[PDB]
Amino acid sequence: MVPRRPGYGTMGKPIKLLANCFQVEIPKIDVYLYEVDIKPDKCPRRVNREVVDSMVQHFKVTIFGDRRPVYDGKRSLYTANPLPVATTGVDLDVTPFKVSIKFLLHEVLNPVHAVDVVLRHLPSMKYTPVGRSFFSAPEGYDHPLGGGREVWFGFHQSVRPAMWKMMLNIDVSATAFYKAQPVIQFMCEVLDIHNIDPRPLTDSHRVKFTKEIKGLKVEVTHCRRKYRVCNVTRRPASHQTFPLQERTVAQYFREKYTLQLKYPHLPCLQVGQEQKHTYLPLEVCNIVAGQRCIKKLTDNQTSTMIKATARSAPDRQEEISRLVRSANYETDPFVQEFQFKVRDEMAHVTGRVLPAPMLQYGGRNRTVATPSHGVWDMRGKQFHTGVEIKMWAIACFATQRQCREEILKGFTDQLRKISKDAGMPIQGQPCFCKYAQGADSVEPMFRHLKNTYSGLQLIIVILPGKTPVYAEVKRVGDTLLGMATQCVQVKNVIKTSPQTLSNLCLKINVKLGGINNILVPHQRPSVFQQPVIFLGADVTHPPAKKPSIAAVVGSMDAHPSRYCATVRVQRPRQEIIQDLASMVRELLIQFYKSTRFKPTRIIFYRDGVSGQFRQVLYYELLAIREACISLEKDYQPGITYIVVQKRHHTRLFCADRTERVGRSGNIPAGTTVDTDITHPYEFDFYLCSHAGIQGTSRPSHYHVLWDDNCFTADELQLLTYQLCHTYVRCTRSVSIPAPAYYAHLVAFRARYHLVDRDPQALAKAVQIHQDTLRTMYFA
RNA sequence: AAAAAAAAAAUU
């Protein structure tokens, strides 16, 4: 099972820190659960909670005595002392239907969640709950995004049984909502028309409008009643008719609610079903307040949201500080019935900052490089093994008007200038260059490109921006012909910022196969005395029918530097990797043909997990094992599987203003916090592997859920840290170890391959040509 | 797509 903690690390310089985690004391008396059944079940959880609470208030005199309870909004009731109920329950009805209701943690350190509903049922009565977080409309404010879409500021709130006490996480959320507004003004926003008041209804407009409003809710008149939208009518309000004792919706509203439609050419809204024959015009329809955005946001909208949330750790912590005392949790009738005590102060925890390892470079200088706070440069330092390019070609998919002769001449000259100093000589003039336009000129250009040039290594496409050609360029370069790419936008082919080019050298030198740097081997954990292979993993889902994509990368050196890559397609919204076994098989074979050793140690990071450990650890660990028991006998390689979490709501701030680093005032790279806030029994730990430059850092939470290598806590912590510096696209420290960052790009560069028998079209679409399977293409 | 990091993933 999940191996317990082998110990706590002590290497590294200690530092005092603060976690948005609050210790909670839970009372000795047992908790009694009272199930509540309501009928029917055709309404939101908020409506359920409202009806039961109003019920309790109306008839509390004898039914409930003098007591204040909490309730999960659904079917779970909590009280402090045994409730005055009879047998299976008492026939009680609140109006609006008839409800019949049918009626540890200390020792371990339902009962864990039972406290959650108590600390959650006061704010859940207040704000708009979104699963685990809440939101409040900004009182006297506006934060629009366009298209009638807003963003509201709220907070995540989850309890966790931290080691030695119950603990409650509070952390700011900033997610998108929909502006309560007239459906007309909303429609005007959606169709990018300010005020059209010719568009009677272009048939495609009639469907593009419902493309977004379909499946929303709406309120009648202008503020009433409330109904659920289902579709836009084909014929307008003056025409669409429903039978009553058969009036059109226009004449009906014209003669029974004495309201003349200003816009009778506009369509109607379906509510309920296409059988209830219930119809509502847009004029008398306001959007309800509190709607959430499930549709995928545009890139620009995502950037605007990012700006809304990227604030520095110092002045942000002082908003969490307010947030905990804002609801005044020790003055809540719900928690004080059950004697709940919290700490309105932050959690003090002393972590340890591991030492990043010095990196070995080559060329003439043989310079060892030491990283400072996550960064190191390369000026006057040559690659460990840089490549020499005899042949290479340019393909500008911007027009001649933007990109011109003398601008490539300058750009290429500058790059050839810096690359030879960087240890990767790009001497000679490019044997080929041609301007191009569109997504469709790509493919035959590239086929002629292979057949006429023998010895042609790399092609650098110069695109203008977000053009459909990128998907083609990648899709072709990988799966059709199997030669190496490196794009660039004209924006950067014009200005030759050296840090831009010197990054381009890093990506390109490894896409041809070279190795930019290695670790000075004597500063490595004990795991490098023996053969060990490292494996990343990610799973990218669609928003929505589009499939999920799964990817794995494999260590191919002992530094470990180079990585091979494979990838598979799978069902929507499914989380587990279906064919991990054979992917590991092919990569173990790749390792056996690169280093000529059978690997004895497998160290295996995984990202993309949501209550999904019970089912993925046990399954994927055997999918690896049978990849091993698939080859020969006496092959029981040691598998240690670690799961990384870039998506919690745990943060850590420095407890000394002198230490608050940078203009974001963020925490340093390489801190480890496996004590106090972490899970007790299970072997997990936090490592803020990166350097926070913008906003406020998210620390990576690594859960070691299996360890056959009996790793001492330091042997594993330092190891994951040294791995985090093995990234090639930049000389910086990333949040997750390089393999976990590689399967992310593979799965991210398979959805460009998707965007264009049935299994073979979508299966071959991802599988790369053999001449580019042995390469670092994803970077 | 030079780059790491920062952002939610009863009516009609």
UniProtKB/Swiss-Prot annotation:
InterPro entries: AGO3 (IPR028603), ArgoL1 (IPR014811), ArgoL2 (IPR032472), Argonaute_Mid_dom (IPR032473), Argonaute_N (IPR032474), PAZ_dom (IPR003100), PAZ_dom_sf (IPR036085), Piwi (IPR003165). Its EC number is 3.1.26.n2. It holds the Pfam family ArgoL2. Keywords: Acetylation, Cytoplasm, Endonuclease, Hydrolase, Metal-binding, Nuclease, Phosphoprotein, Ribonucleoprotein, RNA-binding, RNA-mediated gene silencing, Translation regulation, Ubl conjugation. Gene3D superfamilies: 3.40.50.2300, paz domain, Ribonuclease H-like superfamily/Ribonuclease H. SUPFAM superfamilies: PAZ domain (SSF101690), Ribonuclease H-like (SSF53098). GO terms for biological process: miRNA processing; miRNA-mediated gene silencing by inhibition of translation; mRNA catabolic process; positive regulation of gene expression; positive regulation of non-canonical NF-kappaB signal transduction; pre-miRNA processing; regulation of stem cell proliferation; regulatory ncRNA-mediated post-transcriptional gene silencing. One of its GO terms (molecular function) is RNA endonuclease activity. Residues 182-289 form the PAZ domain. Residues 470-507, 694-741 are annotated as: Interaction with guide RNA. A divalent metal cation binds at D538, E575, D607, H744. It is found in: Cytoplasm, P-body. It is an enzyme of class 3 (hydrolase). Its main location: cytoplasm. Residues 458-755 form the Piwi domain. One of its GO terms (cellular component) is cytosol. It catalyses: Endonucleolytic cleavage to 5'-phosphomonoester. Ubiquitinated on surface-exposed lysines by a SCF-like E3 ubiquitin-protein ligase complex containing ZSWIM8 during target-directed microRNA degradation (TDMD), a process that mediates degradation of microRNAs (miRNAs). Ubiquitination by the SCF-like E3 ubiquitin-protein ligase complex containing ZSWIM8 leads to its subsequent degradation, thereby exposing miRNAs for degradation. ZSWIM8 recognizes and binds AGO3 when it is engaged with a TDMD target. Interacts with EIF4B, IMP8, PRMT5 and TNRC6B. Interacts with APOBEC3F, APOBEC3G and APOBEC3H. Interacts with EDC4. Belongs to the argonaute family. Ago subfamily. HAMAP family: AGO3. Required for RNA-mediated gene silencing (RNAi). Binds to short RNAs such as microRNAs (miRNAs) and represses the translation of mRNAs which are complementary to them. Proposed to be involved in stabilization of small RNA derivates (siRNA) derived from processed RNA polymerase III-transcribed Alu repeats containing a DR2 retinoic acid response element (RARE) in stem cells and in the subsequent siRNA-dependent degradation of a subset of RNA polymerase II-transcribed coding mRNAs by recruiting a mRNA decapping complex involving EDC4. This is Protein argonaute-3. It comes from Homo sapiens (Human). The lineage of its organism: Eukaryota, Metazoa, Chordata, Craniata, Vertebrata.
